[PDB]
Amino acid sequence: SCRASEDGPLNSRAISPWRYELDRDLNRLPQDLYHARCLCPHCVSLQTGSHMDPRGNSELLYHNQTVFYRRPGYCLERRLYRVSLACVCVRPRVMG
Amino acid sequence: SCRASEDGPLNSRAISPWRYELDRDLNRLPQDLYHARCLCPHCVSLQTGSHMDPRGNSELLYHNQTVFYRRPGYCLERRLYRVSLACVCVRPRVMG
Amino acid sequence: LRLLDHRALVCSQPGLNCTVKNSTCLDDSWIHPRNLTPSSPKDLQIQLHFAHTQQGDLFPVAHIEWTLQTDASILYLEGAELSVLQLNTNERLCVRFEFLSKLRHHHRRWRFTFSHFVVDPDQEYEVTVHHLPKPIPDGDPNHQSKNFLVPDCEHARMKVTTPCMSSGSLWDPNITVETLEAHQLRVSFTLWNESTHYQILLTSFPHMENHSCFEHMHHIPAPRPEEFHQRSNVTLTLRNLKGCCRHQVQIQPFFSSCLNDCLRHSATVSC
Amino acid sequence: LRLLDHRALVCSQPGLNCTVKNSTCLDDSWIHPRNLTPSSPKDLQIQLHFAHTQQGDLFPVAHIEWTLQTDASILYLEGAELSVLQLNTNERLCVRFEFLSKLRHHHRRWRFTFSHFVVDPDQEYEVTVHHLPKPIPDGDPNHQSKNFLVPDCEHARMKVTTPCMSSGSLWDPNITVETLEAHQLRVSFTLWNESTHYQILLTSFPHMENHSCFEHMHHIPAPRPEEFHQRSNVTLTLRNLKGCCRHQVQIQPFFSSCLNDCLRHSATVSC
Amino acid sequence: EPTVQCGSETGPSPEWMLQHDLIPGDLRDLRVEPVTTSVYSILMNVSWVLRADASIRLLKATKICVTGKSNFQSYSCVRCNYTEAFQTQTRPSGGKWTFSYIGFPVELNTVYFIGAHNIPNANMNEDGPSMSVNFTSPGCLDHIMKYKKKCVKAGSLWDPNITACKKNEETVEVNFTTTPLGNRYMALIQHSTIIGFSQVFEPHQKKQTRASVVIPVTGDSEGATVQLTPYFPTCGSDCIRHKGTVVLCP
Amino acid sequence: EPTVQCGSETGPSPEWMLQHDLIPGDLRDLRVEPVTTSVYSILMNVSWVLRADASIRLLKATKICVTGKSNFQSYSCVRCNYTEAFQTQTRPSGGKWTFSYIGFPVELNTVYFIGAHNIPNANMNEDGPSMSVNFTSPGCLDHIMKYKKKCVKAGSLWDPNITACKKNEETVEVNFTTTPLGNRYMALIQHSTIIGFSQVFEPHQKKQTRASVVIPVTGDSEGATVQLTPYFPTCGSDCIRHKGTVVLCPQT
Ligand SMILES: *[C@@H]1O[C@H](CO)[C@@H](O[C@@H]2O[C@H](CO)[C@@H](O)[C@H](O)[C@H]2NC(C)=O)[C@H](O)[C@H]1NC(C)=O
Ligand SMILES: *[C@@H]1O[C@H](CO)[C@@H](O[C@@H]2O[C@H](CO)[C@@H](O)[C@H](O)[C@H]2NC(C)=O)[C@H](O)[C@H]1NC(C)=O
Ligand SMILES: *[C@@H]1O[C@H](CO)[C@@H](O[C@@H]2O[C@H](CO)[C@@H](O)[C@H](O)[C@H]2NC(C)=O)[C@H](O)[C@H]1NC(C)=O
Ligand SMILES: *[C@@H]1O[C@H](CO)[C@@H](O[C@@H]2O[C@H](CO)[C@@H](O)[C@H](O)[C@H]2NC(C)=O)[C@H](O)[C@H]1NC(C)=O
Ligand SMILES: *[C@@H]1O[C@H](CO)[C@@H](O)[C@H](O)[C@H]1NC(C)=O
Ligand SMILES: *[C@@H]1O[C@H](CO)[C@@H](O)[C@H](O)[C@H]1NC(C)=O
Ligand SMILES: *[C@@H]1O[C@H](CO)[C@@H](O)[C@H](O)[C@H]1NC(C)=O
Ligand SMILES: *[C@@H]1O[C@H](CO)[C@@H](O)[C@H](O)[C@H]1NC(C)=O
Ligand SMILES: *[C@@H]1O[C@H](CO)[C@@H](O)[C@H](O)[C@H]1NC(C)=O
Ligand SMILES: *[C@@H]1O[C@H](CO)[C@@H](O)[C@H](O)[C@H]1NC(C)=O
Ligand SMILES: *[C@@H]1O[C@H](CO)[C@@H](O)[C@H](O)[C@H]1NC(C)=O
Ligand SMILES: *[C@@H]1O[C@H](CO)[C@@H](O)[C@H](O)[C@H]1NC(C)=O
Ligand SMILES: *[C@@H]1O[C@H](CO)[C@@H](O)[C@H](O)[C@H]1NC(C)=O
Ligand SMILES: *[C@@H]1O[C@H](CO)[C@@H](O)[C@H](O)[C@H]1NC(C)=O
Ligand SMILES: *[C@@H]1O[C@H](CO)[C@@H](O)[C@H](O)[C@H]1NC(C)=O
Ligand SMILES: *[C@@H]1O[C@H](CO)[C@@H](O)[C@H](O)[C@H]1NC(C)=O
Ligand SMILES: *[C@@H]1O[C@H](CO)[C@@H](O)[C@H](O)[C@H]1NC(C)=O
Ligand SMILES: *[C@@H]1O[C@H](CO)[C@@H](O)[C@H](O)[C@H]1NC(C)=O
């Protein structure tokens, strides 16, 4: 399932590719949010792009995004949300 | 300038490492905003972490943040800003 | 299949004057279109239910129930119709409905259900729900249907059903197969409350083989009422052969129901 | 190093009465600490300026300017003092200042400027700015300084300066070195407007070598006023040697200024 | 007889806060596709099929918002109204209802997610009334899209012609025609790992442009791959690359 | 003898909107250091030296805010006050001014940026007054910091004892002790590139815990390095690895 393409956006061309899932809700701005899930447990190889390389680890990145909610007409409230943006390649941690 | 450490946070351990620069202002929330300027033109090698590997490319990622400004007392103005979060390792595009 | 109770059926739900009727079926196809065709129902399900009769005869019944959809189409609703179809016997019944009063979406829920139909075990059941007026030609469908699997009486819950005992499974004949003398076997077992003949099929097979050296049939005459619930004893002489030690003996009733088709109880004796 | 002239000095700025004065300085036992001494100045710079004179003695002067911070310390300011210090000769002079009335920060900009002092060419000048009261012992300093470089005479604007006119770099001698006969050289050049003697230093070197085969000195007596700005002709007999064709001839004055130290003009003749 | 009248608005819809007792149906069908208008720009063509047989006796408009996510974040949408109410459930002329709108300019190498719902919207504690589709834009390597200003400035139009031959056992000679656009180039040689590497700086050649770059190589370089990377300023470090091959020089 | 009373506040300072005729100086000196409380938490000890000889005749307080950035964003800060009015420049008792405040909790592997300025703040079109310092926290590989409940679940205190010897030319056997925390592990062998690979699944062994894992290797595997990676659920994919070495098992 771990593969690297040749063209298109970064998600299909990054060493640590990420897909987009769907977070549906009725009272949120926007209605649909798209998080990122790292499909490969490790970083892919540079020479080919279709195989895996175990010398790496995959981690997500998060950031707070301003969204709005309603709550009882109705009332408008503001609250942040935690949404994943992109997976990056990080080096292992060793002990010994 | 293209080196990877063993411990510490991601910026000292990621294959595409980035450093933080200083943006100063007197009418911004926050006063200081720290962008990312990743160093090496290409991604680093996994086997050593101290040399460079040219098969990859480096690219910043941007996201919109909420900041407030002053304007004439003072006035409350809300507009977004462009900041850089982290660079990632992307694959090249080759033609022919 | 047949309707159970002729008492005035109750479909009353808060704020409605509903009637239930077994009108003409016409299967599920009919032509009577009009201007506006209301929307389709939602979340139709059927559940298993058990209930007795005035005599106490516990019959199996189905708990058909379904929900509604939320839209303005509820304003133009006029009627509904229920159908039951049989795959094996191809006999189909029908249920008619209506709504004497118009409905407004007032409280955000509306439920329908019914459990007044007896089902037969081990039969597939098809139930479809339709809404009136019927669709205009070349229109979107407004009917949904699903299947229904019914187990056999040998299941514990299906066991206690009243219709079962007419050629049922609760009647466990205690099978006593004794080696007795050489080349002779004596079999004793209890029989049930029906004056219908039985049959014993004694088949002998060689060990580790499905072929039969010797097969014998014994006919048991029609029981008398005084002989009900009393063990019947039959002795049979076996074949004088070596290696054909495996013997299969089975009993088959010929009750009024499932005649020639009821289940057989086979006992295996190995040496 | 000397103030240009004595005239009521102008330092006035809007909403301020100011006085200028030259008096004792050098901070000999200058320990005068008071309670709350204002902050340090900000953005002090010195520029170069040329000022004419009534009789024509154009002089180069240094334009010193500086700004102020914007803290609350401006309330307690009382005074200032300027110092100019020489490195080689150690001769040094000071000028004092004062603010008669208390200044309130109304608008955000304040500047102080002054260029009424003549600097000497090609000298290093140190300018220091102090604020009063003087700091308490073990306190934060409140004085800043800088170094200033003066170009020499050969600079384009420094050419026309009259202190440089004294022993003028503008005195350009048309040097005419004629080979003439063998083992003889004739040189003619113009001289300046002072009765000061000139010494000709004729040195002959072999080609591609810095050693000297023959070195001769000629004395030119003190010129009369009638001979000013008239070409002086001197002929010298050269050494009768082969390969020592390179000849260096240099001329230096003994003017009233830079005596024994004024620059020399050396002309090289190669064969 | 209704038609479509599209404008633009991003933010809170005034009818969301207010409660509604009767709600419409949904979008029965929805398709999107790209259509190009030229003499550059590409626009979006989105077509939808309305609800059938019911749930339309009351309806006001529809909203379509689209999010693009590649090296950025983008979100803006346009809400359109319907001029006249609906009397019937299918077009009297014949066929199902079908509307469309053209707009929403497209960038390069960005994935778009398109969603819509009917107006007024569903109250709280009800089913999800939405349906969505997804669509990916073409890149810059394609033949049709080589002539945009950005790509040509990054060098899509450029024809860097390369002829690299094995000079000797340890060095290889590369010839390539320069451009006034750039001045510095890299060099990569890949067979199994890096066998050679260099960095060059040459100005523009109004003179004859055949190059004279020599690069040291480790081992037999025959049958390797020559990859060239230009340092064009406008594409930063992500500039398109071109292939080259190793040939034998007698 | 002035003292500093500190409380928490994040957002717009009310003095920013208003206009101030006179402003104070800035912070002369600033230092940030970490402290550890006896048992388990980490707090940062700050200290600042107030301006000298002037610009303190009028002043109210000093705000500090801190931004941390690692796999997350963070921003929260406290404006802390001063109680007494200032009449002099240095201590009447002697020496410069040394204040401090303890707080601002510390996470793991996060870079911290500390900034501050004096109150009230500079008006528009003036000089940038502030000064800032940076600080970094240790990880979970140091001896003094192996005992958070957070990092123990990742296996900081684990004692995975390992023994890997070369069974034959193409096979190397790995012996190691299991744990009730883990169920699945990797196996990586690195000399120049991958020479072998595997993936194993075994539950906790209340019996004897000496392992038996067979991994195929390519070429001579002598002298390679053996790394192990456990799938402890708490750490996700960032679980710490423990090194190992290959020895020679003799047939004798
Ligand atoms: C790439 O450049 C080379 C060199 O300019 C071209 O080689 C020329 O080939 C033609 C034959 O078609 C010869 O007549 C010329 O003499 C060659 N050039 C030189 C300088 O000798 C080559 O054709 C070019 N290829 C492309 C695709 O542009
Ligand atoms: C690449 O370019 C170089 C020069 O930039 C070419 O080298 C010249 O080739 C001609 C062809 O006969 C010779 O006459 C010259 O003596 C060569 N040197 C120079 C300095 O001009 C070379 O031929 C080109 N092609 C290849 C494949 O290297
Ligand atoms: C790791 O485990 C091995 C085996 O489980 C330990 O080896 C023991 O070593 C001692 C002496 O060093 C012997 O007396 C035991 O018999 C060994 N145990 C065996 C063979 O099962 C070893 O001590 C442990 N620790 C380390 C650091 O290797
Ligand atoms: C690694 O573990 C294996 C078994 O898990 C050990 O093999 C055992 O060796 C002893 C003698 O040392 C035998 O009595 C046992 O029968 C063996 N186990 C089995 C299952 O047969 C091995 O000694 C351990 N250490 C290594 C390989 O270095
Ligand atoms: C709707 O009803 C009208 C009667 O006023 C009739 O003329 C028309 O044909 C009907 N349309 C449909 C689609 O049934
Ligand atoms: C058999 O006998 C009665 C009468 O026919 C029948 O109704 C019943 O099912 C059986 N009796 C019992 C005790 O099950
Ligand atoms: C069958 O045999 C058993 C035991 O020998 C006896 O109890 C029973 O009465 C017999 N039944 C008949 C019908 O003879
Ligand atoms: C400041 O003034 C007060 C006024 O009484 C005096 O007591 C104090 O000594 C002064 N501070 C000095 C001189 O440093
Ligand atoms: C030389 O003569 C006078 C007197 O010394 C002097 O002032 C003047 O500058 C000089 N003459 C010229 C033409 O410069
Ligand atoms: C020097 O010689 C030139 C030309 O021979 C002549 O014009 C000039 O008057 C001479 N100078 C003197 C002082 O005689
Ligand atoms: C729909 O009508 C409203 C009400 O006037 C208007 O604000 C909105 O812009 C319209 N939508 C369009 C023009 O797309
Ligand atoms: C985000 O920043 C980009 C920067 O160009 C801007 O175009 C866009 O309008 C901003 N907002 C959204 C929602 O994308
Ligand atoms: C959009 O696409 C449809 C079908 O693909 C086509 O009929 C229509 O002409 C296109 N353009 C517009 C403006 O609808
Ligand atoms: C994106 O499009 C593909 C096309 O087949 C579809 O299978 C997938 O579900 C879509 N993704 C989402 C999040 O809807
Ligand atoms: C600092 O002073 C402000 C102004 O009155 C006050 O609101 C705030 O609570 C003070 N901070 C404390 C007491 O920690
Ligand atoms: C961002 O979100 C996190 C959620 O863990 C929250 O703790 C934090 O206060 C938010 N704000 C900042 C500036 O980090
Ligand atoms: C903080 O650090 C300073 C500097 O050594 C020290 O004097 C002080 O005791 C520490 N703790 C506090 C609470 O200030
Ligand atoms: C971080 O601290 C070091 C201390 O030597 C300093 O050199 C560096 O400039 C600081 N970084 C920033 C962004 O201020």
Author numbering:
A (entry chain A), B (entry chain B): 73 to 144, 154 to 177
C (entry chain E), D (entry chain F): 33 to 303
E (entry chain C): 19 to 57, 62 to 272
F (entry chain D): 19 to 57, 62 to 274
Give me lines lifted from the publication on this model.
With the goal of obtaining the IL-25–IL-17RB–IL-17RA ternary complex structure, we mixed excess purified IL-17RA with purified IL-25–IL-17RB before vitrification for cryo-EM. During initial 2D classification, we observed classes of particles that appeared to be the IL-25–IL-17RB homodimer with IL-17RA ‘wings’. Data collection and refinement resulted in a C2-symmetric map with a global resolution of 3.66 Å and confirmed that these particles were indeed IL-25–IL-17RB–IL-17RA ternary complexes. The ternary complex consists of a 2:2 IL-25–IL-17RB homodimeric core flanked by two copies of IL-17RA. Notably, the IL-17RA molecules do not directly contact IL-25, interacting solely with IL-17RB. The D1 domains of IL-17RA and IL-17RB interact at their membrane-distal tips through highly complementary surfaces. In this geometry, the membrane-proximal regions of IL-17RA and IL-17RB are separated by approximately 94 Å, rather than being in close proximity as seen in other classes of dimeric signalling receptor such as cytokine receptors and RTKs. The IL-17RA–IL-17RB interface (BSA = 570 Å2) is mediated by complementary surfaces composed of IL-17RA α1 and loops 1, 3, 6 and 8, and IL-17RB 310 helix 1 and loops 2, 4, 7 and 9. The interface is stabilized by core hydrophobic interactions near the centre, with a primary interaction mediated by IL-17RA α1 burying into a groove formed by 310 helix 1 and loops 2 and 9 of IL-17RB. The IL-17RA–IL-17RB interface is further stabilized by an extensive network of hydrogen bonds and salt bridges.
The IL-17 family of cytokines and receptors have central roles in host defence against infection and development of inflammatory diseases. The IL-17 family of cystine-knot cytokines consists of six members: IL-17A–F, which exhibit differential binding specificities to five receptors, IL-17RA–E. The most well-studied IL-17 cytokines, IL-17A and IL-17F, are produced by T helper 17 (TH17) cells and are elevated in the context of inflammation. IL-17E (also known as IL-25) is a key regulator of type 2 immune responses and driver of inflammatory diseases, such as allergic asthma, and requires both IL-17 receptor A (IL-17RA) and IL-17RB to elicit functional responses. Thus, IL-17RA serves as an organizing hub mediating IL-17 family signalling at the membrane by acting either as a direct receptor for IL-17 ligands or as a co-receptor.
